[PDB]
PDB file of C-alpha atoms in Angstrom:
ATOM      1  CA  UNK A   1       7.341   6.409  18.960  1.00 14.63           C
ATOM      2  CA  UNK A   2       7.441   5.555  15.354  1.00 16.44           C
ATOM      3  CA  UNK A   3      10.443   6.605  12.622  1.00 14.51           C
ATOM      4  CA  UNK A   4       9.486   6.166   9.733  1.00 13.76           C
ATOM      5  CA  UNK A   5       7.070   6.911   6.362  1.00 14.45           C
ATOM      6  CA  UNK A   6       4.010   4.545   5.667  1.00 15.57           C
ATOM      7  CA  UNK A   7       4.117   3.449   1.556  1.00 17.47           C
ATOM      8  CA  UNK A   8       3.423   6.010  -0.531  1.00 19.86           C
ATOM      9  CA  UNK A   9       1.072   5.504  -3.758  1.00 21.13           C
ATOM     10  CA  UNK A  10       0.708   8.109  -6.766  1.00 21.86           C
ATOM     11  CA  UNK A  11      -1.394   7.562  -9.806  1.00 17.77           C
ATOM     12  CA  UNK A  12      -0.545   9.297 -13.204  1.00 20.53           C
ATOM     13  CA  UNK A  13      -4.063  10.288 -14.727  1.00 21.88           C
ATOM     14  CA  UNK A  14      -4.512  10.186 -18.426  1.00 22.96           C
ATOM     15  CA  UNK A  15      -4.419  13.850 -18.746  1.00 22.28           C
ATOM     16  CA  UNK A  16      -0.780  13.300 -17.017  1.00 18.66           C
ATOM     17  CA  UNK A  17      -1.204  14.609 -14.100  1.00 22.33           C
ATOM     18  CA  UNK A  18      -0.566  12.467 -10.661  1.00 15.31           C
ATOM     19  CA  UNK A  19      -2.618  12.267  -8.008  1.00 21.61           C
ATOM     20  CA  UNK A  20      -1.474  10.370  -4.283  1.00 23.66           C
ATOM     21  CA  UNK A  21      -2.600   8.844  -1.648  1.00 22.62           C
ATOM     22  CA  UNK A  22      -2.041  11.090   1.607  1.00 25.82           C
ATOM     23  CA  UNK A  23       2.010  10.969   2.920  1.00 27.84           C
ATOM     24  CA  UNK A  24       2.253   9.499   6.729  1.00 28.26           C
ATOM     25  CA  UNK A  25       5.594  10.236   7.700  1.00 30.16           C
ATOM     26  CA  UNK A  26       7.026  11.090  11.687  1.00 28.47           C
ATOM     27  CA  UNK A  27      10.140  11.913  12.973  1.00 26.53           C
ATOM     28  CA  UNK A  28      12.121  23.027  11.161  1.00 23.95           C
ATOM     29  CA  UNK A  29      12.253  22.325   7.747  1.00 26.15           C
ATOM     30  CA  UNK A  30      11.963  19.083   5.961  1.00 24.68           C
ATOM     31  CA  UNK A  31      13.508  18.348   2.179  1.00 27.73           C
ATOM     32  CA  UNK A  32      13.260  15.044  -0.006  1.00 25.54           C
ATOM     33  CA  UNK A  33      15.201  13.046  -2.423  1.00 24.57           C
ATOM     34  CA  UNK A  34      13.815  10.240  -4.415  1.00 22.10           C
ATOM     35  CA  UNK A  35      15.995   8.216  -6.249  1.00 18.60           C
ATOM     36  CA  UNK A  36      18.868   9.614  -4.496  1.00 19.23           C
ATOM     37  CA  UNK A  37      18.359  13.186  -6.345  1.00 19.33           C
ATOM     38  CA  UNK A  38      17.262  16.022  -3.896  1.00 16.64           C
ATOM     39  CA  UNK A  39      14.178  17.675  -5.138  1.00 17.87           C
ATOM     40  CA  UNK A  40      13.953  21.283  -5.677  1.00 16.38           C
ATOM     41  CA  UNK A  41      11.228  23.886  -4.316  1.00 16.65           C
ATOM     42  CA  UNK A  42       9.086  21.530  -2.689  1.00 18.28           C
ATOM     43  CA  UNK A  43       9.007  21.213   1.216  1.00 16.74           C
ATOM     44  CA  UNK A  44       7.459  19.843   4.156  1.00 15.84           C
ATOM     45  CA  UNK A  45       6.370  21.252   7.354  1.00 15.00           C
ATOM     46  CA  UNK A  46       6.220  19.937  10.689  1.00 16.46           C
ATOM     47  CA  UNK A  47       3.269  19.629  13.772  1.00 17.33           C
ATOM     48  CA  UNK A  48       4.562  19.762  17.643  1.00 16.55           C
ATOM     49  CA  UNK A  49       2.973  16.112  17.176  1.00 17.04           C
ATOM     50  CA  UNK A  50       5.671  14.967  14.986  1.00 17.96           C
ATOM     51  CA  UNK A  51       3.524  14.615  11.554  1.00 17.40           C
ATOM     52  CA  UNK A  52       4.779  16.162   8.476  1.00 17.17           C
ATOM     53  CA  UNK A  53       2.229  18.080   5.926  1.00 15.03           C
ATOM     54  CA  UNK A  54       2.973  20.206   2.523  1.00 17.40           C
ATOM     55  CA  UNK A  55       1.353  24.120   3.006  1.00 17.32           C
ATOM     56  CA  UNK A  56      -0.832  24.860   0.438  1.00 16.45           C
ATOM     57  CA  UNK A  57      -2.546  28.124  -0.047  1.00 16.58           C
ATOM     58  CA  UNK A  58      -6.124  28.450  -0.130  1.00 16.69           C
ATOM     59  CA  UNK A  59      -8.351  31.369  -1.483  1.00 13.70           C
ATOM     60  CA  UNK A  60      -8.358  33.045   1.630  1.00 14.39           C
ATOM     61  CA  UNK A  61      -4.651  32.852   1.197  1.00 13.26           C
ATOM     62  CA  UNK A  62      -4.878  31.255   4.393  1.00 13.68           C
ATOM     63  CA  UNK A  63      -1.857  28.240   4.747  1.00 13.74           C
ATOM     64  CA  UNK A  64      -3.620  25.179   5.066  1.00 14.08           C
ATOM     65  CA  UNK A  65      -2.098  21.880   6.209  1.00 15.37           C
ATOM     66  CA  UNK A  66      -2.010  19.450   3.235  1.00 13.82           C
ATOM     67  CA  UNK A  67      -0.952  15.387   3.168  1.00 13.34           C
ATOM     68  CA  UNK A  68      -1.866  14.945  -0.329  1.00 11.56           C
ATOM     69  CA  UNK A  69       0.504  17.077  -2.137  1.00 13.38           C
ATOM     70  CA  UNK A  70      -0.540  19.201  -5.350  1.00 15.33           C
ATOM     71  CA  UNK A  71      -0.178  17.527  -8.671  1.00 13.79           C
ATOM     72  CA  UNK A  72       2.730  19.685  -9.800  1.00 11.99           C
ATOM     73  CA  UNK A  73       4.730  19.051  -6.567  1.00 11.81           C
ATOM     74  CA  UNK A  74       4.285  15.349  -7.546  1.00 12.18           C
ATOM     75  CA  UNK A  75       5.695  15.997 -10.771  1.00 10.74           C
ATOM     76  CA  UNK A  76       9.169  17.242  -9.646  1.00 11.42           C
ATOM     77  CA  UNK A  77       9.995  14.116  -7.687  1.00 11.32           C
ATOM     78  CA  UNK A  78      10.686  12.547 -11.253  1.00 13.75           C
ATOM     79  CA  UNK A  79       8.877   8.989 -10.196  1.00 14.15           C
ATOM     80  CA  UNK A  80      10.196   5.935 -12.293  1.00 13.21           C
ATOM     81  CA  UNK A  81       6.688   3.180 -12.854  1.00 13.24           C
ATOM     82  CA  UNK A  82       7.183   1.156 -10.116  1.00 11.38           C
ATOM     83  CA  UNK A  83       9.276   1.491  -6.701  1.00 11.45           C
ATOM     84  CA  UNK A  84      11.161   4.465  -5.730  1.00 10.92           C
ATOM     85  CA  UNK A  85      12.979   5.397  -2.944  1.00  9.96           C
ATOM     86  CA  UNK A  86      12.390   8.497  -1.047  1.00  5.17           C
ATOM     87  CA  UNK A  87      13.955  10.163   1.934  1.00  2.76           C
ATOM     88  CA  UNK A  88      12.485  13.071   4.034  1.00  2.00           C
ATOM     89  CA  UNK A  89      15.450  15.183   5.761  1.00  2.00           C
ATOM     90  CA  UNK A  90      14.223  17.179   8.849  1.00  2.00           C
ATOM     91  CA  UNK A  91      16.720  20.127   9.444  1.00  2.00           C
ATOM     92  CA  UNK A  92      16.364  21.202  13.108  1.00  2.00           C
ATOM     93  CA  UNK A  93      18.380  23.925  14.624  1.00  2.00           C
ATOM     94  CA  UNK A  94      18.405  22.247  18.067  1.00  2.00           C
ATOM     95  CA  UNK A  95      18.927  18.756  17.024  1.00  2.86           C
ATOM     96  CA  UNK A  96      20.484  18.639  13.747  1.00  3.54           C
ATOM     97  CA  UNK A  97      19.623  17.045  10.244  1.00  3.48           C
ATOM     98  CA  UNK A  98      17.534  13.713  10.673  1.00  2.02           C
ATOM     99  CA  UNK A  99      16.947  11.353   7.682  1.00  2.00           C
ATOM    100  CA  UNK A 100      13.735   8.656   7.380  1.00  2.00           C
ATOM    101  CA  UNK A 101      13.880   6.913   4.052  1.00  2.28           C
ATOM    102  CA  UNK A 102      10.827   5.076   2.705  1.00  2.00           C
ATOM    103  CA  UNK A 103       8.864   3.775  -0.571  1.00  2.00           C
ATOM    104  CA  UNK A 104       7.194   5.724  -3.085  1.00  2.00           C
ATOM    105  CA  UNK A 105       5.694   3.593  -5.903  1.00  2.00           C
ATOM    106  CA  UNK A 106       4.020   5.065  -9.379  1.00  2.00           C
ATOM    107  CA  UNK A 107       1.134   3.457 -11.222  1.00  2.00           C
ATOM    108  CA  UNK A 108      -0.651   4.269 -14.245  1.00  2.00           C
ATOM    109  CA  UNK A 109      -4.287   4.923 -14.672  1.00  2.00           C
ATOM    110  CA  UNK A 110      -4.809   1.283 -16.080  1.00  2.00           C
ATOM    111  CA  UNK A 111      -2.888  -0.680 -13.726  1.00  2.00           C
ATOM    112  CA  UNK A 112      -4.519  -3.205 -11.762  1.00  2.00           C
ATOM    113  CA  UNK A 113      -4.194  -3.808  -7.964  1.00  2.00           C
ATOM    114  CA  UNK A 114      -4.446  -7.172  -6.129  1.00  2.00           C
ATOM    115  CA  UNK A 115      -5.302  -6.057  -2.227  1.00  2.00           C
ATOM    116  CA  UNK A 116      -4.338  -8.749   0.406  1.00  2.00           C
ATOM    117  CA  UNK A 117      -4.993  -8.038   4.141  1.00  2.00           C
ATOM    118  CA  UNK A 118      -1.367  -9.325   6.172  1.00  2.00           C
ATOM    119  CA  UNK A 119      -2.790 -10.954   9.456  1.00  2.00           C
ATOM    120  CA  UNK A 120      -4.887 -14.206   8.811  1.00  3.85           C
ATOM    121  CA  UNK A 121      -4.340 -13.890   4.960  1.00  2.65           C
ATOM    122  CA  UNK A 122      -0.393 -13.869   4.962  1.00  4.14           C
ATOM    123  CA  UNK A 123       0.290 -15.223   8.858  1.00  3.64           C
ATOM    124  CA  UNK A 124      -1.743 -17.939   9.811  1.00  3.27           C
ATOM    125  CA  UNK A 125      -3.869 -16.560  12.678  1.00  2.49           C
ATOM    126  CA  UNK A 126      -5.355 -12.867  12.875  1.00  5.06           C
ATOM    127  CA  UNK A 127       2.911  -7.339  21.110  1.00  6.30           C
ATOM    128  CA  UNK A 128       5.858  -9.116  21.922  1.00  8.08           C
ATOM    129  CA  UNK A 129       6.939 -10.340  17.886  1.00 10.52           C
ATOM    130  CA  UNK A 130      10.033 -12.064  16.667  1.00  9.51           C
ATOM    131  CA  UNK A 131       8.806 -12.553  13.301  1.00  9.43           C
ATOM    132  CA  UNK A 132       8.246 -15.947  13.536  1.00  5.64           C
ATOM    133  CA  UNK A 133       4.358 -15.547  12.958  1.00  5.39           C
ATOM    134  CA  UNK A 134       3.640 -19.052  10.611  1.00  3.05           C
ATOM    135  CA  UNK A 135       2.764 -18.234   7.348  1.00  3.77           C
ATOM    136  CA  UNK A 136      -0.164 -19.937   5.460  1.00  2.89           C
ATOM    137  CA  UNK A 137       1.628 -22.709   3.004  1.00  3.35           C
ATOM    138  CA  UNK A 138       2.231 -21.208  -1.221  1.00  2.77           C
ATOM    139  CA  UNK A 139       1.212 -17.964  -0.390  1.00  2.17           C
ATOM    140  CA  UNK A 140       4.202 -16.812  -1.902  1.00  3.84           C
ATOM    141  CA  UNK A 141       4.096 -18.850  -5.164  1.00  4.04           C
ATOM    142  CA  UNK A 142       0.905 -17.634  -5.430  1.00  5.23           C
ATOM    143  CA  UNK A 143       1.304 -13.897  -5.211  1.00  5.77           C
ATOM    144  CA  UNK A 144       4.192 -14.037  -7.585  1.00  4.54           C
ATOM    145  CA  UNK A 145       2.507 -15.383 -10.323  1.00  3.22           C
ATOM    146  CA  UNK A 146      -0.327 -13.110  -9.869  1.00  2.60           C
ATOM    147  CA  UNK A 147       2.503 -10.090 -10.346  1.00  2.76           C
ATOM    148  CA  UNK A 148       4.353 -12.301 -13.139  1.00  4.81           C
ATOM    149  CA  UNK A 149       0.682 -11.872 -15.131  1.00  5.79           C
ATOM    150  CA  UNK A 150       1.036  -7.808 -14.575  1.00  4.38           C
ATOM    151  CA  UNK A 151      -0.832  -7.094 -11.683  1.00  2.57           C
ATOM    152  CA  UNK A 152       0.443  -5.299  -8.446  1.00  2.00           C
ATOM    153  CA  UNK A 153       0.203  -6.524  -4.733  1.00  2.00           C
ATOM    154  CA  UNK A 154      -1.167  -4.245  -2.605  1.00  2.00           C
ATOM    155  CA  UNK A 155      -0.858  -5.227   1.336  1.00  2.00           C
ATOM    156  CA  UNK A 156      -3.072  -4.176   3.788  1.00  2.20           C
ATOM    157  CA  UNK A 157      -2.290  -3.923   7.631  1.00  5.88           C
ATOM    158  CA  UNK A 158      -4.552  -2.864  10.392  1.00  6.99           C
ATOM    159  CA  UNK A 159      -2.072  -3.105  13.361  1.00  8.99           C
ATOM    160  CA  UNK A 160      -0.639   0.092  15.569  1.00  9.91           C
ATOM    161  CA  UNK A 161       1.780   1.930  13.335  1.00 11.76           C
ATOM    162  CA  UNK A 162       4.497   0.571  15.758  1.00  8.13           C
ATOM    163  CA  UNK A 163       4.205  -2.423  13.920  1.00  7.09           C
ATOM    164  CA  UNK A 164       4.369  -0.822  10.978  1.00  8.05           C
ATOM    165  CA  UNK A 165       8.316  -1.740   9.977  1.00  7.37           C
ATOM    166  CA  UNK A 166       8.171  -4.958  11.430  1.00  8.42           C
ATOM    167  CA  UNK A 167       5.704  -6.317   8.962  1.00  6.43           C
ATOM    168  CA  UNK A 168       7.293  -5.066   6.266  1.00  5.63           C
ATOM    169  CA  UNK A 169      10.423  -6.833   7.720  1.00  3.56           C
ATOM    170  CA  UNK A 170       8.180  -9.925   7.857  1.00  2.00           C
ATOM    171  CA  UNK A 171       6.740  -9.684   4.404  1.00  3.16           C
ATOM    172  CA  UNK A 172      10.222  -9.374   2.579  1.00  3.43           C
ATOM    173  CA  UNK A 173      11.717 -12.327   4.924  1.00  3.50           C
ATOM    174  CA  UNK A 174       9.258 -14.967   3.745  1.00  4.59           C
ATOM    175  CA  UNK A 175      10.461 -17.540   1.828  1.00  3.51           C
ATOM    176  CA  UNK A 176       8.215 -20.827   0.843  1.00  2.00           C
ATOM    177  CA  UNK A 177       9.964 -23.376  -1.412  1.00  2.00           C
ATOM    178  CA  UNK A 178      12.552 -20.620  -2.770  1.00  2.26           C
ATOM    179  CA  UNK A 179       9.416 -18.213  -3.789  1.00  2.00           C
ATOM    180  CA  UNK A 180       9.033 -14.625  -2.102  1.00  2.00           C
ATOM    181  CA  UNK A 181       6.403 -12.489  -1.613  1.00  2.00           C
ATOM    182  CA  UNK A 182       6.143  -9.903  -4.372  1.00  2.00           C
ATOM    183  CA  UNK A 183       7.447  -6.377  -3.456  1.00  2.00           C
ATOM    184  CA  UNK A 184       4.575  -4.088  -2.990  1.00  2.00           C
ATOM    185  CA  UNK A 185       3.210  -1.348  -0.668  1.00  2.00           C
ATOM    186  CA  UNK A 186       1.962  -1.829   2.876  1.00  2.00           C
ATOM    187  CA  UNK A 187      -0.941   0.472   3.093  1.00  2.00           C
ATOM    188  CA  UNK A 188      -1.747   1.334   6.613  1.00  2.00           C
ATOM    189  CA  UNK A 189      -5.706   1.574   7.947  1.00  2.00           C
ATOM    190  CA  UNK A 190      -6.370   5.522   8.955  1.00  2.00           C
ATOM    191  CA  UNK A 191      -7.092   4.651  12.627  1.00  2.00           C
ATOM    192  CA  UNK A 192      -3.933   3.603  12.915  1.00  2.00           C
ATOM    193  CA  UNK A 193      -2.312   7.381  12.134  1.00  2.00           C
ATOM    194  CA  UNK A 194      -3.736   9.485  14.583  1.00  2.00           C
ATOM    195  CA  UNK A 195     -15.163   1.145   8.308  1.00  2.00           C
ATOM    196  CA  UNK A 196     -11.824   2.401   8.600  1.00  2.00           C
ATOM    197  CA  UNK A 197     -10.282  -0.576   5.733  1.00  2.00           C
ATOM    198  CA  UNK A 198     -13.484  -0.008   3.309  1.00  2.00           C
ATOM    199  CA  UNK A 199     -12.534   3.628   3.706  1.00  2.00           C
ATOM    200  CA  UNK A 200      -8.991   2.918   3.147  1.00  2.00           C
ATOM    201  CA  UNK A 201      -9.859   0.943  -0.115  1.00  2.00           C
ATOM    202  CA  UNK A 202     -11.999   3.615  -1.554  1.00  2.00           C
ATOM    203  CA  UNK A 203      -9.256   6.504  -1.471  1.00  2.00           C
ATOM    204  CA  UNK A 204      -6.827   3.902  -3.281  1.00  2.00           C
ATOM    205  CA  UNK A 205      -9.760   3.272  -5.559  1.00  2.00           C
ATOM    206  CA  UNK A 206     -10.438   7.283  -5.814  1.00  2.00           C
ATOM    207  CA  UNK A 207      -7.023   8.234  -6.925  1.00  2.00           C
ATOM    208  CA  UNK A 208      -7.662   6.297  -9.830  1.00  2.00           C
ATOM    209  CA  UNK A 209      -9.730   7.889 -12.683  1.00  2.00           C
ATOM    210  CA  UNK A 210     -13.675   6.790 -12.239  1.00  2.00           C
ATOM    211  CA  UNK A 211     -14.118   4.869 -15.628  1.00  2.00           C
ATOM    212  CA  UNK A 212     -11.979   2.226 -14.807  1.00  2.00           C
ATOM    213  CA  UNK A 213     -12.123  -0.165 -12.037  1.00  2.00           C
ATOM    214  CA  UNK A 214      -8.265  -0.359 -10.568  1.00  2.00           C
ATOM    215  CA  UNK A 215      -9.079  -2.704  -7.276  1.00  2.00           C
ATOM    216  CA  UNK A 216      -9.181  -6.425  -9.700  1.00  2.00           C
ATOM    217  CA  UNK A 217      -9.157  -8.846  -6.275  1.00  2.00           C
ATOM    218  CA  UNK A 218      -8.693  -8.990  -2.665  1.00  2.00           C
ATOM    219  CA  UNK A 219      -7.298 -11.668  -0.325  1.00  2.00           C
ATOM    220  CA  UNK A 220      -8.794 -11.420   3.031  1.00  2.00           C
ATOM    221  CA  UNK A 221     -10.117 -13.674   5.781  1.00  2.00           C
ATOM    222  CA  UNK A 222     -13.291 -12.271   7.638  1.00  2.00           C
ATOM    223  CA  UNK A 223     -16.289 -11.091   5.973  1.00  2.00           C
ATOM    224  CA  UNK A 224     -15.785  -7.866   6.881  1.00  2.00           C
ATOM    225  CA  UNK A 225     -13.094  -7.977   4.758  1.00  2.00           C
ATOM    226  CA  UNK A 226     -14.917  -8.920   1.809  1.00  2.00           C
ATOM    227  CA  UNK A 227     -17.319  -6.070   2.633  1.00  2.00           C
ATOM    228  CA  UNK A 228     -14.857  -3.611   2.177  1.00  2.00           C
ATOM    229  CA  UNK A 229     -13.496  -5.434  -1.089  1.00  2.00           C
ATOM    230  CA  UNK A 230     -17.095  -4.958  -2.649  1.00  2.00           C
ATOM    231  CA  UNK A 231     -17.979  -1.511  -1.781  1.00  2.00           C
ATOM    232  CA  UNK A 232     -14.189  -0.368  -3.391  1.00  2.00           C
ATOM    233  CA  UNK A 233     -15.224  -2.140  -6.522  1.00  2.00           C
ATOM    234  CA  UNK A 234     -13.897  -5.758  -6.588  1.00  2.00           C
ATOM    235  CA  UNK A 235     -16.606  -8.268  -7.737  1.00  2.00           C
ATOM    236  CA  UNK A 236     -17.574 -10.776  -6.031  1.00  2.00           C
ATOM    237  CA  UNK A 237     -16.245 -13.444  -8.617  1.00  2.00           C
ATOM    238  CA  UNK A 238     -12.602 -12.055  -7.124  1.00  2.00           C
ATOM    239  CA  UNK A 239     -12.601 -12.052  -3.342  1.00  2.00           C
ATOM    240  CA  UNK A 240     -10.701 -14.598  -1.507  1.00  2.00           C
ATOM    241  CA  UNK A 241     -11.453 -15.367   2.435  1.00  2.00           C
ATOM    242  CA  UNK A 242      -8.986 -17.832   4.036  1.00  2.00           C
ATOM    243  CA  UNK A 243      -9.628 -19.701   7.499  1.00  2.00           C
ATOM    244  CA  UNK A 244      -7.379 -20.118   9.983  1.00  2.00           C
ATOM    245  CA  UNK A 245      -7.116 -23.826   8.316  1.00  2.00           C
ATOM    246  CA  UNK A 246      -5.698 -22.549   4.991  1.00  2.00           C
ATOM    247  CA  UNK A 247      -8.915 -23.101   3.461  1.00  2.00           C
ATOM    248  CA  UNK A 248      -9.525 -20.168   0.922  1.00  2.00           C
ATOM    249  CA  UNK A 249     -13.306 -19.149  -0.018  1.00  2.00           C
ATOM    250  CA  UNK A 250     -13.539 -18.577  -3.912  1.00  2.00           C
ATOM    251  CA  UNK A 251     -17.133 -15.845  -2.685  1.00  2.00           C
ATOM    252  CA  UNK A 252     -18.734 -15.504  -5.967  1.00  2.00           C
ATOM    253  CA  UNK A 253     -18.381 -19.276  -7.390  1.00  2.00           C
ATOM    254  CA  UNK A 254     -19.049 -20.145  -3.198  1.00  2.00           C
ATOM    255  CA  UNK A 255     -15.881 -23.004  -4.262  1.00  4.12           C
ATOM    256  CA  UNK A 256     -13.833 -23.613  -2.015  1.00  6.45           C
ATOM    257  CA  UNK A 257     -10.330 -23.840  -2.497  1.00  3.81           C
ATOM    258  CA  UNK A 258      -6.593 -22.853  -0.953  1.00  5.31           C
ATOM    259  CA  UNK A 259      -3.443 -20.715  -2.105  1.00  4.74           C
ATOM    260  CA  UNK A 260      -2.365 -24.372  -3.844  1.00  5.24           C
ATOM    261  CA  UNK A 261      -4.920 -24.907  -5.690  1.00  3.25           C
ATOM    262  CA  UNK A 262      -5.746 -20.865  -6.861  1.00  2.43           C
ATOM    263  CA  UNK A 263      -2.175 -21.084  -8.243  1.00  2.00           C
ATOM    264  CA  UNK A 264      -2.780 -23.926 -10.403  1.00  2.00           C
ATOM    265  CA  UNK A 265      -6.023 -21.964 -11.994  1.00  2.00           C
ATOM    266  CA  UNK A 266      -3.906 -18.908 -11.843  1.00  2.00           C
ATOM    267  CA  UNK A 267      -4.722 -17.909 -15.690  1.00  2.00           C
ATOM    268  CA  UNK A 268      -7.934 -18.708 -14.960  1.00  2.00           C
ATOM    269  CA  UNK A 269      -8.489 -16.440 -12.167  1.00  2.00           C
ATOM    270  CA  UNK A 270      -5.630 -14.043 -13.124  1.00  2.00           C
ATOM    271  CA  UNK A 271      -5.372 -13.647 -16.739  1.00  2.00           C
ATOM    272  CA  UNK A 272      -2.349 -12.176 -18.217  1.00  2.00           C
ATOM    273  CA  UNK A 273      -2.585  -8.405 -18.816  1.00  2.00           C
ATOM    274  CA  UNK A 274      -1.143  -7.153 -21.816  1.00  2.00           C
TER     275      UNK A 274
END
């Protein structure tokens, strides 16, 4: 079974308080450090299943079992913008102290996210893995310029959580002509953590405030991924679908195109924030 904690994502709201995505973690008590610096008064609680949840107090005064943690828990983990690392510490009496590390990253209300699905988007073609799934040609050159301009990749994986570590193992492997694929989280689709990617995309979208529009693009390549895109509030002008022949669908200008090609328009299609 699975070891480990899926990407976590927390949004700082412009009255400053933070809002996250829900934490999947598996391995009793359980304590966290981020950054290396143990964090004080908040805790975790564990299911016979293995999952981990935060007890919150509702007005019945009745515990209930909470993945999204409360805003002021958030704000004692002392997030840095961007990456941070986090571990979860399980103390058992049985079996000891056991340690899962993952990512945590912090965004601001006006960042902007670029979604790409992993399997046919980043691999060519959508059990037994070495890691030597091919990899569509300037993906990578691509995806770092987008980040160069200021926006954030945002990966998107529907396989069995098993997987989970291995792709992230594959994504930070990949090198194409000395360029790498830019560091971001590897959001997992619900059904995968015991419809389900649009409704992954619009709880990314709704921990962002509702006046701005965080999703910008999304890299996919079947329609249902572009379905998903839409309804999470990516126009149509910025959806990508890719064929298993590298050939990228530009949906709203119906051009087509490919990774090479996107990259040369990338201020274009990408404009520098400021």
């Amino acid at each position: 079974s699975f070891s480990g904690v899926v990407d976590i994502i927390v949004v700082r709201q412009p009255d400053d308080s933070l809002k996250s995505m829900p934490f999947h973690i598996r391995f009793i008590n359980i304590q966290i450090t981020v950054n290396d610096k143990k964090i004080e008064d908040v805790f975790m609680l564990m299911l016979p299943e293995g999952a981990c949840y935060f007890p919150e107090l509702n007005a019945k005064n009745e515990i209930q079992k909470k993945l999204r943690p409360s805003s002021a828990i958030l704000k004692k983990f002392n997030l840095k913008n961007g990456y941070n690392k986090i571990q979860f510490i399980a103390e058992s009496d049985l079996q000891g102290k056991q340690l899962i590390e993952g990512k945590i990253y912090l965004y601001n209300y006006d960042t902007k996210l670029v979604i790409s699905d992993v399997n046919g988007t980043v691999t060519k073609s959508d059990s037994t893995i070495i890691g030597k799934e091919w990899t569509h040609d300037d993906i990578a050159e691509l995806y770092t310029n987008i980040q160069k301009n200021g926006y954030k990749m945002v990966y998107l994986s529907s396989r069995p959580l098993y997987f989970y570590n291995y792709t992230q193992g594959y994504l930070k492997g990949i090198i194409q002509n000395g360029f790498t694929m830019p560091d971001g989280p590897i959001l997992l689709s619900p059904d995968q953590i015991i419809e389900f990617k649009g409704a992954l995309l619009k709880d990314l979208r709704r921990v962002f405030p509702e006046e701005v529009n965080p999703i910008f693009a999304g890299f996919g390549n079947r329609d249902t991924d572009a379905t998903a895109c839409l309804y999470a509030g990516v126009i149509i002008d910025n959806i990508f679908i890719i064929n298993e022949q590298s050939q990228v669908e530009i949906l709203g200008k119906q051009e087509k195109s490919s990774y090479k090609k996107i990259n040369e328009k990338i201020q274009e299609l990408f404009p520098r924030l400021p």
